[PDB]
């Protein structure tokens, strides 16, 4: 499926365990602690991803 | 007594909108007559009149 143009298509085996089956990885969350706004929050996201 | 109209956003958070008289116009009994209501005919009538 990595073939398919302009789209994300992933096949995955169920965690087949629990709520930590996708294991490893990490679930991070970026918070807006002031009234920054969506635009600025987005930019902060890009800066972090960069 | 004041009146909660609807909501508005303030730096990202939903907050209230209140409409109420400026203090000096709601401190004394006689001040009740200073408020006018529009009549169907179109002229202003004071509370003192009803």
From Swiss-Prot, chain B:
It is found in: Cell inner membrane. Disruption phenotype: Loss of susceptibility to contact-dependent growth inhibition (CDI); inhibiting cells still contact the target. Signal peptide: none annotated. It comes from the Bacteria. Induction: Positively regulated by MarA, Rob and SoxS transcriptional regulators (at protein level). Belongs to the resistance-nodulation-cell division (RND) (TC 2.A.6) family. Homotrimer, with large domains that extend into the periplasm, interacts with AcrA and TolC. AcrA may be required to stably link this protein and TolC. Interacts with AcrZ. Part of the AcrA-AcrB-AcrZ-TolC efflux pump. AcrA-AcrB-AcrZ-TolC is a drug efflux protein complex with broad substrate specificity that uses the proton motive force to export substrates. This is Multidrug efflux pump subunit AcrB.
């Amino acid at each position: 499926f990595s073939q398919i143009k302009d789209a994300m298509v992933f096949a995955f085996n169920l965690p087949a365990i629990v709520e930590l089956g996708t294991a490893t990885g990490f679930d991070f969350e970026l918070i807006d602690q002031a009234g920054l706004g969506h635009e600025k929050l987005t930019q902060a996201r890009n800066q972090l991803l960069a | 007594g004041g009146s909660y109209v609807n909501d508005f956003i303030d730096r990202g958070r939903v907050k209230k909108v209140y409409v109420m008289s400026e203090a000096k116009y709601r401190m004394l009994p006689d001040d009740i007559g200073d408020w006018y209501v529009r009549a169907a005919d179109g002229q202003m009538v004071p509370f003192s009149a009803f």
